[PDB]
Design a protein around this ligand. Structure first.
Ligand SMILES: N=C(N)N[C@@H]1CCCCNC(=O)[C@H](Cc2cccc(CN)c2)NC(=O)[C@H](CCCCN)NC(=O)Cc2cccc(c2)CNC(=O)CNC1=O
Lengths: 155, 41
């Protein structure tokens, strides 16, 4: 129920399902963006995953244990979004990040535009390590999208 | 209540010889205490 990999986050009531996001299972912990689950518990098969750590400002939440993803964008190299869009199989998109310049420093950012339910898809370095999650971003003047490469702290 | 659940969707693997794309924008942004980014204009 916690096998390593990328997962869709789905909701259903009485009718069909909706994909609200995506996340990463690593080292027994499930990692997604806070806005996907709002910190609610997750079903995994017959099991229940409870939120362990989260932070609204970083827009991140981990389940079953503390945040495990610690790889960082090197500030130089191309990256891959492993996009898991609603209704489509996972696909890798390579890009050279831009930069969100903030008063607290620079954050890598990817100019790649996918449906809202792609939120939580992992962004990878060339070793396949997850350097952050896709889906907290901004809309620029022409209506296109730029996502921060959002990474947590592994304590 | 709403059934929020997960389902496996793949292995996490860098793809060699991948489609490379998108630009590299240099944006001035602010981050508020609700986790929302906005453009500084
Ligand atoms: N608008 C374009 N071109 N592309 C986006 C791509 C979305 C990728 C996944 N991320 C999200 O859904 C988050 C949710 C979200 C929303 C609010 C707060 C948080 C948590 N801090 C998270 N979202 C975003 O970051 C952005 C910027 C957020 C700025 C702070 N509030 N929010 C939007 O894009 C809204 C939007 C604006 C204009 C048109 C459309 C949607 C219509 N597009 C779609 O209906 C599918 N595409 C789209 O929605």
């Amino acid at each position: 129920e916690t096998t390593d990999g990328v997962y869709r986050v789905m909701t259903r009531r009485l009718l069909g399902s909706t994909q609200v996001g995506v996340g990463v299972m690593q080292e027994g912990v499930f990692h997604t963006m806070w806005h996907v689950t709002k910190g609610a518990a997750l079903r995994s098969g017959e099991g229940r995953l409870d939120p362990y750590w989260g932070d609204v400002k970083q827009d991140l939440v981990s389940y079953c244990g503390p945040w495990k993803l610690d790889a960082a964008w090197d500030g130089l190299s191309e990256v891959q979004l492993l996009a898991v869009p609603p209704g489509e199989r996972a696909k890798n998109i390579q890009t050279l990040p831009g930069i969100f310049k903030t008063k607290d420093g620079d954050i890598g950012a990817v100019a790649l535009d996918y449906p809202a339910g792609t939120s939580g898809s992992p962004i990878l370095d060339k070793c396949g390590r997850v350097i952050g999650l896709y889906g907290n971003g901004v809309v620029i003047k022409n209506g296109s999208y730029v996502s921060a490469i959002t990474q947590g702290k592994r304590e | 209540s709403v059934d929020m659940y997960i389902e496996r969707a793949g292995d996490i693997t860098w793809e060699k010889d991948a489609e490379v794309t998108g630009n590299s924008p240099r944006l001035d942004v602010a981050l508020d205490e609700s986790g929302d980014f906005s453009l500084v204009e």
